[PDB]
Input
Amino acid sequence: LWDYDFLQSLGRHSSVTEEHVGLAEKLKGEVKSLITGPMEPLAKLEFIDSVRRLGLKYQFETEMKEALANISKDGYDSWWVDNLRATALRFRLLRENGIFVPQDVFERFQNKETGKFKNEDVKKLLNLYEASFLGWEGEDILDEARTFSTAQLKNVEKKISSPNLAKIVHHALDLPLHWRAIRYEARWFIDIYEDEEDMNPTLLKYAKLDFNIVQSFHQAEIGRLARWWVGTGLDKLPFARNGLIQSYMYAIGMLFEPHLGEVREMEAKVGALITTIDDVYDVYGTMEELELFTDITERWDINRVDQLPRNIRMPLLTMFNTSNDIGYWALKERGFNGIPYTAKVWADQLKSYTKEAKWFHEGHKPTLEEYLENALVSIANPNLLVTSYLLTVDNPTKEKLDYVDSLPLFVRASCILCRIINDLGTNLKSIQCYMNETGASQEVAREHIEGLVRMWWKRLNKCLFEPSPFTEPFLSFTINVVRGSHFFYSWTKNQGMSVLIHPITL
Output
């Protein structure tokens, strides 16, 4: 079911019913009451985390913020100061929602003489581990929590007693919740939450209902994109097999909400173009042919597409036509001609590809810093984020678009993260560049690269608390694209059927 005839078919028959929407809106009001209803503070924290874990955060963002704000009041601070499980859980949720909590909050639990956590509970270890990924640079206490809890959970996993709990452990060790793509995890979590003892039936049922309703929107989107892809004719080309569906899966990680379907579809279209144009430069095109493709894009002039061969001219024209349509959409819906920006990100995209082509053909071995300045662009994420900004920013202007295209720290941090995350999972790449600069071993070099991921994430985390020109949903896209990269890096086919095709049985 990587076959396009199947995909084009989607959107014809939807599983959801008029009854399900009414029940969903009934359940939604009840969950809002529960989110806002009185509750013990630690219990509220698990429920709110459970709501976020299920992917319902978009539905109850405001109720969640009031609830956390109210828990941060001067009255009754006694319940979480003494025990680490509440202190860790409270620290993460407050930080995730914009309420600052200092790292010194964990000093009580730390041993003063040793400086390491008192060896003196699995959930206690788990909450500490997840919370450590919400840390900023220089918050050394959190770094200690990270290394300690990882080592303890790996040791404790062998003696794990509960089967549902045992799964939860292995999953957290694979990727912390902070780094997991929201839509894919919600599907996984629905099965895990259900079996959890203290599980709430009303929330689970609403979570199941909401997951199914959102999936139908995805199915229609997949159908249009599939029909659009065959229409381009790139589907019959040798490169980018199943390129559209993989690219769509990436857009799901960045944004999954139905109200952003038009933006998501345009993003999926660009990714499919991104995958295919990448292959033309990496494999099919000859270097003499590629300079023309890049030059045509820099000029945004198609007079010589005839000179280029068909197996290359069609992707170039699909990219030319697709950027103009997306730019036009901005002019139609947003009152702003977006063609200069889509052309610019496509121009730099190829220029970035050519530079990598230059290094591999000249036997160059770049330094990690040298390699990353280009690789952050070639992963193409500047193109995807700037495009996402154009289609969603309120009252767009030349001034706003130029700033985002300049790659400020918040956007740039996300871009650098994706290139390194992609490298770790799969010319010489980022591990080899490190190996050439230091001669280090494959595992140690790999260990250092894993370190950069954590550093940039800290930078990404601190940026969310700083004043910024960006607002939702661009802020979420920047964090979410990084989570999506973690998700993609065979096995991707299994996640697709589970999230996009198969409905949750009721």
User: Anything to note?
Assistant: The chain has two domains: 17-213, 214-506. The chain is about 70% helix and 0% strand. Residues 17-213 form one domain.
